Symmetry: D2
Subunit: 323 residues, 4 copies
Amino acid sequence: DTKLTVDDITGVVGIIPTPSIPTADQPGTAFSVDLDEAATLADAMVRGGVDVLMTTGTFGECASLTWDELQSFVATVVDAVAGRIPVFAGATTLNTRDTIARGRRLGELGADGLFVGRPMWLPLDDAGIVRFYRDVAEAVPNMALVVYDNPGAFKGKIGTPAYEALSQIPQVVAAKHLGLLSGSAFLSDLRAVSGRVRLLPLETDWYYFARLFPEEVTACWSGNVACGPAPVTHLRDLIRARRWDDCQALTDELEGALETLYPGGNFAEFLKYSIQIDNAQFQAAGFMRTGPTRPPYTEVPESYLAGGREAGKNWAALQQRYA
Amino acid sequence: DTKLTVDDITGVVGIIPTPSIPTADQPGTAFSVDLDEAATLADAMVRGGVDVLMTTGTFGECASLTWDELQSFVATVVDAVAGRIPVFAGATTLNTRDTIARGRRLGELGADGLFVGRPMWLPLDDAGIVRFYRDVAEAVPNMALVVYDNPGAFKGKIGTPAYEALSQIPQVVAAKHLGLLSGSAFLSDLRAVSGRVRLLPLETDWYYFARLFPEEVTACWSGNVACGPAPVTHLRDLIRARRWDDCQALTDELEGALETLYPGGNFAEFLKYSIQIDNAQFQAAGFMRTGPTRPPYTEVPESYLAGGREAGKNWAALQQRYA
Amino acid sequence: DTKLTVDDITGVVGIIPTPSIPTADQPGTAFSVDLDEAATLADAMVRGGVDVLMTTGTFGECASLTWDELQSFVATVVDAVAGRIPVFAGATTLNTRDTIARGRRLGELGADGLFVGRPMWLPLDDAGIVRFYRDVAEAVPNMALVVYDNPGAFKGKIGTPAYEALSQIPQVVAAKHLGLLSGSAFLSDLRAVSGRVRLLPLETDWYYFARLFPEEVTACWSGNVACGPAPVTHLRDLIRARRWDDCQALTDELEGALETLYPGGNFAEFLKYSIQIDNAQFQAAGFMRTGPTRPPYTEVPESYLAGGREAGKNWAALQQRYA
Amino acid sequence: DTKLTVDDITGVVGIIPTPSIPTADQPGTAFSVDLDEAATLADAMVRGGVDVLMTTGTFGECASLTWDELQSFVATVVDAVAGRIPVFAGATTLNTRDTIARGRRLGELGADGLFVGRPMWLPLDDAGIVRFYRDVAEAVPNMALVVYDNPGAFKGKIGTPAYEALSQIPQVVAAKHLGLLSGSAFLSDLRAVSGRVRLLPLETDWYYFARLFPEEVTACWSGNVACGPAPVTHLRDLIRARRWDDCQALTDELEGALETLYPGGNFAEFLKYSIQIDNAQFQAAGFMRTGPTRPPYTEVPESYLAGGREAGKNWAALQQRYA
């Protein structure tokens, strides 16, 4: 089995998008990954202090990359990271067997673990959710697993009873969580895993949960590191120092920079177009370069992209200040 | 260009499940299709008078079959039908380019058309829905298309403006529709396509739309033909003869047989476990043989299977009556 | 018991709004009903061929009228009708005992029956729905009842099992229903009542149901009669004559006139401001005069009002065409 | 204007149910309040150390009491409290003018403030919410106001822009909130009111917000005090002493006692029958005596009541321990 345990998931779990070439929004484009930018981006996350790197969740366009793009992208990221920090390759398909087959191959390319959502053509209940992760874990026992708890994408919030059983699977070392967006669930799920799984809130509410549960909530995830990771690594140091006033001030800065991300403040509307909106944010922040999104997620109200671009520009100023 | 048009879609559009072997619920099973049963079932549909055959929608486990299994199953169905009726192969993936790649291959294997859902990791608005089907049609112009309008599966009902644009695509010959389960929408969508696309209601409300719109609503779709097609082909013959009193009596018989399908009449709840519940119905009806469902959709409340099996046994009595 | 039965509910069931004085939108206005307009409107409905008159449903502002305003309005309407057609007074409160007490008084003022929603602070389940209507029926056995099946307003669609039990209550003579807006349910409910309750669809889909069930669906409700009742009474006459082609053409004209009612075709958005939008339609149609809406439903996007105004103008043209 | 300000809302804001007589579930019962029990309950809350008392929210059956019942119950509570703590009378009707009329009378009967939901027949947008409360404030300026933010009851969560406007109304001194049940909303609303309104979380998550925002979140509301207030006033003393480990332990004890309230852990299922389930909890805890619920909220599954009863028994053990 894997050597990675919950103890290895600390600090900033950075999630990067997949850089794209200018024709990436055309169905006739066979290979749309900018591998040069993928390598420089992954290296910049390491040099920027990111503690764990993950690829190809929702905004990384796990849904819309071909298999050849995904494996080549992951291979490039793994090679650029060069063993400096753990790398979890995002592997999510419509069924258990395809996910196992992808995950086996991604492990063979040097990924240290798998960042795994679940099939969503139909929703899975807690019984089916647990069965799915147990199946993946037993089939690829060498890979650590980060559970992808995205209620909107996968048609349901993972139940606290499911978290109890998932914490008995040794391969499950962390879960990407919604934090306060799921409300009371984070705290219930936290008790359920009983320190056996690192529950990752967003960096915008890491401080709240870390102050309340400092020995357990020692890590966050951030989908913003590709806009500049210095605000999030600075938050990690402030939390370690238990500098709560500064943690609160910085959390307000982070939330203020992302204020325009959700159209009219509506979260559910943002999720309908999250791939497109995040793509505009990554372009505008200027920390990395990337083209358009892949088919079919190329349509979006223009005002939503404006919100994303303003969030990117505001985060760029935070990156400049804290670099 | 495909030679099929809307005029070719008349009568019973039967949708079959994918027969499974006894170990089909195990993640280690490399190939889980019962090809012998697939061929006999496809032949029984033709001999039973089904007018158009489709495979691998939701209950056909499009989500959970491997690519190898889907090709083999469709090739076996195509061979067994032997050109007697048009065969539409269900091809739905997480993105446009994989769907195109699969659709090309399935056409190479002899399918006459594709039964196409749409990517659902994120929802698609009407613009993204139109662009998706336009991309598919332009890339595979030799395949006719049946649009799969499943709001629960694909996270949204197809809008009337999208149906207007879809009816301008020559390859789009039909749409699998919810009928009265989207009460006002079927009529709005029917006007939008203005005779260019066959809008398929369920067999349980075909009579209602046929009597009101005799020149346009000349076909239905049925997910129950693998329990015995005789009640559905009989309904088609009653409708063609405009035997409205008999149509109402038969429609009542179909509804009463399927009454227990939805747990507590709760439709949305049946959507959560439709693969599992329908599988139990196909087993109980006796017309075909099949094993369990494929991972990950193996978990279901026991009493939900009770409703499926009683629906299968009820349907079996109708098949014996009308055969 | 009431001498009114299901047999008496045939033709056009017209629902009128509550005419208001110019200062009706002010919380300091103690009495905001234009009683002169109420009398002339009620008389115009009778002379225009309306078969049954109902008051104070949702757009009649049952929620926002004071108890003194409701008594005076109903008494004025009852006196104006002067026994020419049955009058159903809208009585809906937050609980069973207030509704009973209001209903007894409205019967004393001469109403032939009560048009009754249900308490909605908490939703009622089917047992609670039946218990509520049974309590009302038992407390005022002299009054016929029209069930108000408004899923949005009362937090739930009335279940088919509830309809089965309600059809055993002799006072329950009709139900104001959704028609194709909950298509499958209308047919389920219709079988459930087995002719003992008149299920009223909207005038915009009455033709469809009346052709399929000529013995059962012999009446509709219309919230548009206060814009001019001639198009709807003409539809009644066409249905009686089985002039299906003309029925379809007239249905298309009614839908065309009401097209702009729903903001960007979004029905759910219309429900958010239905009182305000309907008020604009009544003003613009010119068949009656009324002031603004009562507190608290005075806030509404201006563009939404413009859609209601255009629908009122479009309807006034139909009224002119068919008067 | 009222002399109560946000500064006076500190500690435990106790909400009591309305004690009922054995025949309270019959629609023929003219008056169903146990006024003797209400007086002793109110006095027990003062003696138990509750800092602010409120009546007739949802579980207090604000919907189903008659106006005469509400007047007499509030008058009894006010007299028994005898000015020792502030009393907020729950007054929520279907419209602005009835609520204003009720609120003025409840002020004449000695209530210090009004605990006010909002009309819900139609949902109110943020503009409508603000106009309603402003109307109430301007019409009865002698009464302080507690805003009742119950999304399920009133068809929507109060928006952050509405809270900003509400915080400029002097009469608005507190808002009964959902705490972690509306995750990030609590903190957004907290920033919006900027110390001018006391945002009341639940007893079960007060510790978390109080530790993070000790200057602002100095009070909670509790619907459990009529089972015994000693656990809640102890939590208040623990928070004031910043005994965080004890606060966490006590919070876990409160959640443990209440876990059987929700059938199968399903929150939404509890809300459908909250009046009935809470009533069973109040009876079982034995701190107060009460009969059944009022029409129409008398129908409920027996197993749901059993879950409330064990919650009541479990709370009674906490009450004895901390008393």
